[PDB]
From a paper:
Although first discovered as a placental antigen present in the circulation during human pregnancy, the metzincin metalloproteinase PAPP-A (pregnancy-associated plasma protein-A, pappalysin-1, EC 3.4.24.79) is ubiquitously expressed in human tissues. PAPP-A is able to cleave insulin-like growth factor binding proteins (IGFBP) -2, -4, and -5 in the extracellular environment. It consequently causes the release of bound bioactive IGF-1 or -2, which are potent growth factors. The paralogue proteins stanniocalcin (STC)-1 and -2 were recently identified as potent endogenous PAPP-A inhibitors and thus connected with the IGF system.
Author numbering:
A (entry chain A): 44 to 211
B (entry chain C): 94 to 1213
C (entry chain Q): 1133 to 1375
Amino acid sequence: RLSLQNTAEIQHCLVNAGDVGCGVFECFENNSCEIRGLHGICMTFLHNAGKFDAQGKSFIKDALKCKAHALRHRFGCISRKCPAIREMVSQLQRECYLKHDLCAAAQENTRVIVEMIHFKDLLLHEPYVDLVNLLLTCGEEVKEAITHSVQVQCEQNWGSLCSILSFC
Amino acid sequence: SRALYFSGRGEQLRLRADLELPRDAFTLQVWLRAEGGQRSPAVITGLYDKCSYISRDRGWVVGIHTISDQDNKDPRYFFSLKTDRARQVTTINAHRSYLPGQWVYLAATYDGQFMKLYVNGAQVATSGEQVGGIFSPLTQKCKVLMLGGSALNHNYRGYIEHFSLWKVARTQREILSDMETHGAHTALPQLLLQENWDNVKHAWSPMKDGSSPKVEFSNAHGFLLDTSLEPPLCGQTLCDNTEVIASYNQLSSFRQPKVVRYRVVNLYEDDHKNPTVTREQVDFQHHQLAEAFKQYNISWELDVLEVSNSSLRRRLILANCDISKIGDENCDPECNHTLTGHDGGDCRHLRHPAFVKKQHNGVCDMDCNYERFNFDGGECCDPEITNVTQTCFDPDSPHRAYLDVNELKNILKLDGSTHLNIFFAKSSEEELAGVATWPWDKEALMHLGGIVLNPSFYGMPGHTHTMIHQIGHSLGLYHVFRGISEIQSCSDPCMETEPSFETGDLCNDTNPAPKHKSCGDPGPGNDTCGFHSFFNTPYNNFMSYADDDCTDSFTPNQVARMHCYLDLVYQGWQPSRKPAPVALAPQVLGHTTDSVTLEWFPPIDGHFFERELGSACHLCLEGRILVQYASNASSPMPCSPSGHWSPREAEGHPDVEQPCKSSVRTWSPNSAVNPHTVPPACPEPQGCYLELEFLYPLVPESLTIWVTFVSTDWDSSGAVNDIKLLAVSGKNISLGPQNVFCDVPLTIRLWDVGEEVYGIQIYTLDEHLEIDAAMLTSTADTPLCLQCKPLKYKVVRDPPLQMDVASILHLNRKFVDMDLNLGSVYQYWVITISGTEESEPSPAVTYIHGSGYCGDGIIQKDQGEQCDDMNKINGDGCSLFCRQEVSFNCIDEPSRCYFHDGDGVCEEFEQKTSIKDCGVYTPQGFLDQWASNASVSHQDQQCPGWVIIGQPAASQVCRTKVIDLSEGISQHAWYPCTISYPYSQLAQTTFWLRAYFSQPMVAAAVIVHLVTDGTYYGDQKQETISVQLLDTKDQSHDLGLHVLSCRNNPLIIPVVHDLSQPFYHSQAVRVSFSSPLVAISGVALRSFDNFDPVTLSSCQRGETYSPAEQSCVHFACEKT
Amino acid sequence: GLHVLSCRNNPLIIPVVHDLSQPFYHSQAVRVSFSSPLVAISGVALRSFDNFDPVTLSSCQRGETYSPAEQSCVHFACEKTDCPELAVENASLNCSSSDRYHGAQCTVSCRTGYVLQIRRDDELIKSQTGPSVTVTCTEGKWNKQVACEPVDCSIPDHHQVYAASFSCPEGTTFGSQCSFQCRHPAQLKGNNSLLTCMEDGLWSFPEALCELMCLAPPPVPNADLQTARCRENKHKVGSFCKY
Ligand SMILES: [Ca+2]
Ligand SMILES: [Ca+2]
Ligand SMILES: [Ca+2]
Ligand SMILES: [Ca+2]
Ligand SMILES: [Ca+2]
Ligand SMILES: [Ca+2]
Ligand SMILES: [Ca+2]
Ligand SMILES: [Zn+2]
């Protein structure tokens, strides 16, 4: 259901925007498929890569490069339907994260990622959903910290709604 | 003689210093044949001041470039000149887009004050901006003449012959004399040089590294009696020519009862049951056709073809319903049908998400049988799950409930070359019963053409002349209401306000009409434009959309059109093997005391040789050469191995109606994907490639590609990566990237390819390019043409030949009549003999020996002659039959003719047409006031503002996307040269200019003379200027912000205010902008003609108001 | 367009706004359309201008007038009666008739290097491109006043002569001659440095050039010049000296 003019402008951006920077994911925002936060992903994680350790910086640069390059190359003959677009975006995200060792790098900087993650951000965008879903599969201490953080902000912004949804 | 072939890669030459170079006057004249797709801007020859380090523009340059540099569309010849005394370059271009592959004589004359550029010996450009000598003798050694392309690699691709140059500006008489010499070599005092190319190195030197072009022999300096009878604006074939249609109108022998073999195709089941149309319908429709066309000398041999396939009879043969359509979330009434699932759910909106449970059941569900539910994921299209004849609405399954007519034609592979194949479908549309191929279309003679009809109306009384209307479509007959209803808009150049041979229906006997369904005269309000009513509309004509009962005739012009289209397009359809006659009457070249030369035209189909089947000679041409179109096409599927593919659009002849636009009749990298799917980008520089194959492998001589659209963004590589020739040897001959023009097809010479060649592989990196068709021409006397016999001719005269001559045959289409007598009148005609068979004799020509004839250099108005150039070539301002060509007024015998528009002189009929020569002519102007004083924001001695005062030199030309503003610009225009260039502060200094005028007055518009638009080469932003009008009370009436452009320069800005307020006499115009690169050489008040409410607001009886002078003053006389 | 009704504003006065470039349109009627059945209108009034109407004003010629109050342009019998002796400076007067009666024509033509400025009775100076214009005593009045102005070739810049400074003691008006002086190291080579201005608005051919040569290169320390020709001071731009 993605508009043809949207497809043309996204492929123009991709062939124009380089591998580095937010340029690839900047144009991907404001699309008909409503997959948002990619520009936010790049912007926030390039803010906070300095807070990440040296291995964290290496991993985050590698993941950004993988995302841009792969999402540009594999954006070929996929059907016009948005659900397929979201599925392939999630697949590319998880593939880059697993091939660049998201789990251990997150383990070294659990507090930092706790700082970036926000309840509104996970409530709004499916990318950060994929990130946190993989994060809960990246270490018992890391998943415990992520659960504590998500409970804290979820109850801050929801109150009793968060508790009643989290039955036990 | 000899000619020089330049490949365009830098095979340039410098004139040796042994020969002097003229300083005041000269005349260049060369024969040439320019291949298409030159690197724009392209140079062929030029004089350069090699010692002028900063201003290399001094000198003169000839060549071809595109008018409207941005998104290049107009490749034309040009000449540019800048004398050393002059401060800048003037330039001029050709009148029309140059035709590639044609031998043309080009000349350029400069007398020191008049610069003239003449094509084909006809005047097309004159100017006088540059004055005085080109350069002082002091810099004579600095001047170097260098040919083949500029040092900027602006090379030329093609052939050059007879490089001649005078030291004086020759007259039109002189240049036409030199043209008719066409290669005469002799020394004259004014002739600086006359090159025969025999010893080029004697007077010329090559570039470095031996970049030398090729030397060949001049095939022909000129060819008399140009056979390229181009069809009119609405014309598409030779059948549209007025001369041939008149000849067919006069010759009833040409219209002997036309037996046409037409075949009706019927479909049965496997057991030969359930016909698409019953035999009674076929017989009744054939009888109606016979009754309709016996009076037009037309008889129809009815052939009936039958095909039996039960697997196809059950399914639905949709018409005008594309398979790629349906399910596109948009309602398509032509595709809306129950067997299409109401356009696959687009034309049927309902509460869909209640049937999600119906999915995954493994059984076809009607609610799931829509695009939203993926047509149950193909369950309804699965034959095992359910029947596919009423459920398969998904347009992917090979077992679909429906197909289109084109796929059926692909299955059939019929003999359309010998019969008009008739097919049947469902006529969903109400205005017509189907869509039929035109005679000029690709598929008319191919197995894809035919007429589709609805069996519900076929053979039905009351609905029988609609099939006649479809046949009229198939015979090239335009709609009798064309020119009113079929126009693109009211500005369509095919306005049929009156019945004519070139407007709308192209018939002089068909009254103008709108798209009227009924068979009565349309009432008021039926006009699409609304300008005029309709009188005596041909509703009785079979062609009109009138009801089939009322449509009962065909106008004689339509009869002649059908005759001509049968004779030319449908040669193989008619029975017998009678040879094709000569389309037009033979022409009298010239007569001696007792001998006169006679030539005629080739056969209308063009087949100069015998029409034998199987052998390729049925497409052989003169000189025993062969020319063919693209036979088969293919390309790889994206994201898929191999690909196969077969785009029929990229095959055959070029069919696009208008180039420089994305047209569906062309192959595209985008057009090879699923529309409901993201199109993959074509790969990295290996080359997204489309391969073509030809019907007959052959040793080639030249190749041509009809590009229709191209990406406008990147470089000049033409968006084409490489061309890979496919010979029978299996070798892939790489040609590298080429240069493209959106209209002119790419032409390439194939001299080095001496091997049999069957195909081609075009490689492009473009994601928007389009290719229409391809064509190939063979070398001289190719072996595929030797075995076959060329057609001959016999010339018969009234009175007959005095000597008992059997016409000794005619293979050169030439004869000379020894039998002549002064004053005696003779009638001439010719018969085309294809061996022993006899063709229709050509129309006779009446000639009087020793009498004035069309083409003797003397006008004979009694013959209807409007010009006599003594030349039988169109395009020189005088047509083939002594009628002045459009926009080319001329006098004198022989008629030296000129492009009247744009030369610089205005006349009575140019007032309403030539704004360039006469200006705008509405009663709101237009004697423009020019600046008398000019104050600017950044005034300096280097870049003064007072250059804005008055009209600047018209030789100044706007430069688009300037790298920087040199001091040469400042000498004519003002730009802020004083200010520096800090990129953090260049956007805040609002540079402004105040052009004051000698006497304040209001203006209809504002003329802004932009030398530089201010746009940077690396920036896509067009600079904005805040135009304000400063009046006598100095009120800054800010007209507002407007976008600059070199294309619109001189920019014309309309002026609007409030009616409740009066005008205001504008003393000055202030233009303010944030662009340091904007240079304006002058601002003009396009003054209002004869009205001014300013002082009119205070008038009383006893005092008058000057209309033109636009002020109210006390008066002495009047009121008596 | 659409306007909102109100009893307070009754009678409603609506101004007229249109393109002033286009002429007006003589209103024969006013159409008011509304979707309210309760609207009752008792009269429509055209509140006209004083004396201006570009409609017929757009098509007027010399010899016909335009009535102020009634605002239309019509042919007239009287007016345009003033023909004294036609004197134009720096111009040639080809008079059709020597007498200055009604209908006398005289073509005023600007001479070499002259621009024809046409001053009429009001604030419109229109410099016609044609150097010659025929002023007619239409009913005994010269319909246009004409004059001839001189021309100039502007100041000569470095494009005229490179590596030179241009002095114009008498300006650039027609007949002037500006002198270019070769700024060092450029030197004068030729016959004359006074470039003359013609009627073309462009200066004369360069009778001299300002050649820029580098002097003899200084001896590079601890190095000897290998190029014998370089001991001279005459070394054009790009001359090479090997050390
Ligand atoms: Ca559809
Ligand atoms: Ca189902
Ligand atoms: Ca007609
Ligand atoms: Ca095509
Ligand atoms: Ca004649
Ligand atoms: Ca001719
Ligand atoms: Ca003209
Ligand atoms: Zn039709």
